[PDB]
Structures are given as C-alpha cells and as structure tokens.
Amino acid sequence: EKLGDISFSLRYVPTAGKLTVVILEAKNLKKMDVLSDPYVKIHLMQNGKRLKKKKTTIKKNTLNPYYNESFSFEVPFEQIQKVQVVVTVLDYDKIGKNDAIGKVFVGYNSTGAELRHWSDMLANPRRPIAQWHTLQVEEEVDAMLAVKK
Numbered sequence: 805e806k807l808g809d810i811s812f813s814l815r816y817v818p819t820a821g822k823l824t825v826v827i828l829e830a831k832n833l834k835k836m837d838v839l840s841d842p843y844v845k846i847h848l849m850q851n852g853k854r855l856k857k858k859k860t861t862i863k864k865n866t867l868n869p870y871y872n873e874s875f876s877f878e879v880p881f882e883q884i885q886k887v888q889v890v891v892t893v894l895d896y897d898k899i900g901k902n903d904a905i906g907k908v909f910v911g912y913n914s915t916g917a918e919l920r921h922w923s924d925m926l927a928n929p930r931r932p933i934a935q936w937h938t939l940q941v942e943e944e945v946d947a948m949l950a951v952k953k
C-alpha cells in the first residue's frame with residue numbers, strides 16, 4: 805500500500821543561519837479510514853533531541869492537499885550537517901490520537917533522493933529548492949534516524 809508523496813522546498817541562508825522549509829503539497833495519500841484529514845508536522849532534530857516543532861493547517865477530507873505554508877528554523881552554519889528535518893503527514897482525528905500517514909527526513913545522514921535534496925540546498929545557498937519525496941512507514945524512518953554517517 806502506498807502512503808503518498810510530499811512536496812516541499814528547502815532554503816538555507818548560511819550567513820544568518822536560517823533554514824526555511826515550505827510544505828507545498830501532498831498527493832496520493834493513503835486513505836486512513838473507511839477520506840484522510842492531512843496536516844504536516846516538521847521536527848528539527850539533533851541526535852535524538854527535538855530542537856523545534858512546527859505544523860501546517862489541516863485540510864479536511866482530501867488525499868491531495870495543497871498547503872504552501874512556510875516555516876523557519878535557526879540553525880547555525882557549524883550545525884547544519886548535524887541536524888535532521890523530519891516531515892510527517894498525519895490524519896487529524898477529532899476524537900482520538902492523530903495517526904501518522906507517512907514520514908520522511910532530510911539531513912546529512914539521509915539517503916538517496918532525501919540526501920540529494922539536502923545536498924542541493926547546501927550547494928545553492930539562499931535559493932529555495934523544491935522536490936518531491938516518497939512517504940515511508942513511520943517506524944522505518946524512526947529506525948534510520950538513528951544511523952550516523
């Protein structure tokens with residue numbers, strides 16, 4: 805079963821140590837119940853610890869939400885290859901916990917297209933770079949978050 809895909813942009817401003825993530829949209833999200841009510845959480849992490857959290861508004865009853873919602877984080881130059889930006893799409897439930905639809909992260913210890921997006925940001929400072937990412941199962945991303953390069 806596919807969980808969906810998420811589009812976001814990354815921008816790093818080295819002089820000011822400012823990291824901006826814009827959640828653009830998601831597509832083909834998993835239908836969670838017998839349609840999902842997606843919102844997106846961002847966690848900035850450094851070695852298991854949460855430095856900052858942000859989240860988008862909620863788009864009710866859609867597998868294909870459009871957000872274009874921007875979030876900024878303070879990350880000094882010397883720390884930018886030590887953090888992870890963790891992006892989770894969740895299903896808002898009025899009565900009960902909000903279950904995760906899928907998850908992805910970018911940062912130096914990411915891989916494949918996640919690493920490429922992060923590296924393209926760092927190679928092209930001050931410019932937002934947009935890219936799509938395949939959402940993965942929360943527990944599998946959590947496992948990989950713990951593998952250092």
Ligand SMILES: [Pb+2]
Binds near residue numbers: 839840896897898
């Ligand atoms: Pb729901």
